[PDB]
Amino acid sequence: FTLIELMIVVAIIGILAAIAIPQYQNYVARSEGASALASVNPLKTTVE
Amino acid sequence: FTLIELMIVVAIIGILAAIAIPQYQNYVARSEGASALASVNPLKTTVE
Predict the structure, then answer these.
(1) Which of A3, B17, B27, B45 is spaced 20 to 30 A from B2 at the CA atom?
(2) B13/A48 CB distance under 8 A
(3) Distance between CA atoms of A44 and A12, rounded to whole angstroms?
(4) Cα B31 from chain centroid?
(5) Residue B1 with chain A: CB contacts under 8 Å
(6) Distance between CA A48 and CA A39 in Å, rounded?
């Protein structure tokens, strides 16, 4: 009778369907690069 | 969900588009040169 309780649980393991968003790391990378420009931009203004 | 808040911020870093006006220093230079004539001009008049 427990087999059916597991049927959902087999499903539950299954359904997760948005896990590995790697290039999350790559909008993170864009954030890190543009926001790496944020670090320097008033120093343009400072040299000048 | 924060990625979009950053999308503007990536932009915001970007948009600044009139920063390095170097030859500002060179109308400054013209000011400094002509206004360097201002310093002496009544001394023409004084020698004479």
Answers:
(1) B17
(2) no
(3) 54
(4) 12
(5) none
(6) 16
CA A11 to the chain's CA centroid: 25
B16-35 burial, b if ≥16 CB within 10 A, otherwise e? eeeeeeeeeeeeeeeeeeee
Cα A18 off chain centre by? 10
Experimental method: cryo-EM
Q: Which tokens belong to B16?
A: 């600044």
Q: What is the CA radius of gyration of chain A?
A: 23
Residue with tokens 């420009």: A37
Is there a contact between A27 and B3 (Cβ–Cβ < 8 Å)? yes
Tokens encoding B34: 């002509």
- Gap between the Cα atoms of A17 and A24, Å rounded: 15
